[PDB]
Amino acid sequence: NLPWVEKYRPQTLNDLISHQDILSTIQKFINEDRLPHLLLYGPPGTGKTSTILACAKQLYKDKEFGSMVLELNASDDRGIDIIRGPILSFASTRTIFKKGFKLVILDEADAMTQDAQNALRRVIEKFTENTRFCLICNYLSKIIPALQSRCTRFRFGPLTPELMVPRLEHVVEEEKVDISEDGMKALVTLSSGDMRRALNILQSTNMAFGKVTEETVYTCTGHPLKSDIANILDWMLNQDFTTAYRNITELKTLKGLALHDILTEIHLFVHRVDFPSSVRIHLLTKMADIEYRLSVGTNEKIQLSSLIAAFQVTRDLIVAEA
Amino acid sequence: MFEARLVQGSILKKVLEALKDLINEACWDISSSGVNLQSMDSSHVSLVQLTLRSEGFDTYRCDRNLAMGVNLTSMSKILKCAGNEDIITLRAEDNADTLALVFEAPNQEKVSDYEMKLMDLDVEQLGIPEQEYSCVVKMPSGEFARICRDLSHIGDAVVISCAKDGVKFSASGELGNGNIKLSQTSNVDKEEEAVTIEMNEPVQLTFALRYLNFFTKATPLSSTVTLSMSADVPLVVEYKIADMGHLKYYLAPKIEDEEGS
Amino acid sequence: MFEARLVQGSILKKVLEALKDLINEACWDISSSGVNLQSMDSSHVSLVQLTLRSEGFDTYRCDRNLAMGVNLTSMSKILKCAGNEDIITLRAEDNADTLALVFEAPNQEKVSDYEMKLMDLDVEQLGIPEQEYSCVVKMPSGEFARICRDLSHIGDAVVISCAKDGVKFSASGELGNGNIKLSQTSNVDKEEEAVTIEMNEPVQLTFALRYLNFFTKATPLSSTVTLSMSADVPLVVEYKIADMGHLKYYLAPKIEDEEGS
Amino acid sequence: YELPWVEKYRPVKLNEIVGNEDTVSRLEVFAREGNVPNIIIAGPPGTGKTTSILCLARALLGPALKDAMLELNASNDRGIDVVRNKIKMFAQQKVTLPKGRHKIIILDEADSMTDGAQQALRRTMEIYSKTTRFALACNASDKIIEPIQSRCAVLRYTKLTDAQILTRLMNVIEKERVPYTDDGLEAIIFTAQGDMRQALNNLQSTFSGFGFINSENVFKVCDEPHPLLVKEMIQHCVNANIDEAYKILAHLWHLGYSPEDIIGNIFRVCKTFQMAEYLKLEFIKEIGYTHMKIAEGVNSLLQMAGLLARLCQKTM
Ligand SMILES: Nc1ncnc2c1ncn2[C@@H]1O[C@H](COP(=O)(O)OP(=O)(O)OP(O)(O)=S)[C@@H](O)[C@H]1O
Ligand SMILES: Nc1ncnc2c1ncn2[C@@H]1O[C@H](COP(=O)(O)OP(=O)(O)OP(O)(O)=S)[C@@H](O)[C@H]1O
């Protein structure tokens, strides 16, 4: 029928969670008619659009939501023609409706250039009493400090799994699918603290297989397995160079892994492996260099051999220290 | 089954040029009282109400309420097709996707059936508060059109001041200030120049220029114009067009500057 | 304190629509004789000399001689908001910069005070020679306006000739040749339709068509226009207002060098 | 409908401007001399380049300000046609002014114009120099061509110093009767990053939010990486430690911060750290190298861990 995010989107200030100080301050400002221009910034899928849509439906009714709220998003290119186009003409006009300010929801405001953000700074500072902007963005640092200096910012952080699991339990009680502990651990680990990807992965696991366990999530998503990276690190740490190179290139051409994902999972693994500090520094410097060398677009086998090379120098130093 | 017949064809051929450039579509609502048309502009500033009662028509057949959405771009060229003193009829079926405008050609020899499609437009009625207006002015229509054409040469936002003395239309631009004040024109032979003030408390509202020009595009509908304004109520421009009904324009003021001391 | 009361705004309207496409900024000298406007165009080829006498106005008062300078397109747009049957009050004071145009409207109920901002341009006064010329021809102004519009199409610049017989217009344009010659037009019933030759020495001089076209926009000011040509002093086009004053346009020739062959 | 503190407490005279010292004295001399040249005012954004020429114009013209003062921002159209029409039109008007008084045409953001606009601005500044005096507020003076700045004076504005921002902030605090702590003042300095309007906006935001000033309340409404934790990360990188520094980095990474935000706070803390000078310069070079990696498009946690390992490797 419909995706679960479009079915169970929150519509109330209490239905959005972990932002209780932010939502309390927004409710405090909006009961006293003191709401400023808003700048909601954070990771994707943490409740940026739905919070301001809940606040808009609190402020305005269903009939006047389409009139006193203008929404611009990624479908609109954000250059200099837009800021002298529809958003200026929208902000510089009155309405035949009740005497309240307008609202402009500008999705992905970090994609505006410095000239575009300065023109938007002119538009924001020119019209304040009749228009209250809402710029929502991923990176705060991609916008100018003047724009940060005229609109109040709010950091929509990620959702802690301790607070994330009651909503997952609610959506697994409402929608009857098979739930285990390792499936929920895979959900709250692979989702990376945002509800949108957790609900999408849960719905895709329901529609693809039917049950939600750890290996079903891993096979539906393609995330590297923990025992897979354990085998990669074991081959790098206690095998010969040609043996490890052949084993890891067969695992790469079999499992569909890539060297960037191997690099980040090995980077997460080597801070669990209790190395001495010096060989930890050597491994981290070498792996960051391999990440940059893969970023600049070189051959992949040679960088794989350099990763095995760093771990072979590591294993020589570890045995020599033993 | 909707059937309407006008007495003279020039009613539509004066009322639809006022909607040629102002609004983009037309929302005809049918009822036993007659036909109405409420449309908000695309910029959500200008509002047009058109109410034509059933007694003004030559004949009027309707059974249930109908909501109808039409495009004014082709209708604003189809107004040039009809004559001035011919008899026009609007015909609409129950389940059809096309409406017929049946009248006579300007040759007075040829029956003209112009068929126009329906745009299924999802619009909702705003609902006018219809509050007690703090200042009512009765003025001529051509005088208002020529004063908007006069202040179109000075600034892009006129200022209407309404006190017990009367109305002051003032335009300030890069050229220089120009103000025009009217008072007490009851000493005339014709009854259409009675520029009358009907309320006491003064108001001072700044309006856009192009919107008032689009409003004054409807001069030959009637002889007099009722301008209603208040402190926060929008400007209301009321035309008592003939005997079949009336027309209303609603205009929000401009945003005032931060002139606090 | 300078206050001039123009009896009718039609002559001011025709003066400004004559001077609209020629002069960048208009300078007025104010004395007890009246008002004077001696200025150059935007290209320093032509000269305008407008004289308005003191007895032509309704009330004309001036204490000290005033040398004001105003933007012209701004004044054209100010005068565009005026009727044709209204008295015009030009107001200025001793030690300020605002020029006020106060007139009635075609409603004849409302006053209209249009303020304007002057300029601070110091312009050297060029002495008019006031000498005799080589040919003087009296001709109705509509003839000159229509022959300027008629002769603008054939060429880009036109050579005009005057002799003992009459006046002659020639154009060697890209389309071909256009030559007219008119003499002895006094044998009609009307007194305006008359061409009178005063002097003896024949002259042939070439002038730009656009300056003649901008000179002929003073057509309904005067029923009859005067043309004065001479070999050295420039071409003079004089419109005599009936009871107000006069307006002269002076036009410099263009280079037409003979072929070496 | 209360006004924000950015425009509510903007100074109205040259004696209240704390930014420059020699330039504000030059403006004070110019306000009484009456022979003001055309000027170009250069500096960083937000240092007060248009609340100074505005105060000079208001002290110069006085009651004739509304007729003999034109502020042209980049808020309006920035084409060649508007500069050709409006500036020449305004310069051609007459104002009854005293002997040492001229019209002032402020051009805010005069660096975004093309070469044709400034090469026509040469003649507009040269011809109407008796009537009006120009004042171009430019963000960068190198983008201004040499013949423009040859015929006009050049005035330089620096970035607000933290002592000057301290004086202005304590004046605003004493004016608004705000209770305060020194840690909250340090926090509003750190979140201010040298910009005056940013400092005033953050102070009024935390005053409207929580009221009493303390260092914990400043970072609830701004939510940068906390300088205590970032300073602990730099201290662990300088004390030959990688595990505790990566523990702090992972703590600041599981709070969802971008690499750009963490490395910007890393450089801002490492500016005002306390260590050897050559160690500071090597650390700033490594942080700049890693920021070049991150802004190039490598924004993983592994790059920040490699930065931490390189900082720990520089210090033996
Ligand atoms: N706090 C929350 N509580 C419950 N569900 C949430 C919460 N935040 C997000 N969701 C869910 O995740 C979906 C995504 O939320 P949105 O706010 O629309 O995304 P976003 O935060 O704007 O980030 P973008 O748009 O991808 S940059 C919502 O439709 C909900 O289904
Ligand atoms: N030295 C200062 N003393 C007092 N207030 C200052 C000072 N510098 C800046 N401000 C304040 O900061 C704001 C000045 O912003 P603007 O001058 O408009 O920006 P700008 O520096 O001119 O850069 P532009 O004009 O955008 S290129 C006002 O709110 C002033 O009150």
Ligand SMILES: [Mg+2]
């Ligand atoms: Mg969104």
Ligand SMILES: [Mg+2]
């Ligand atoms: Mg500024």
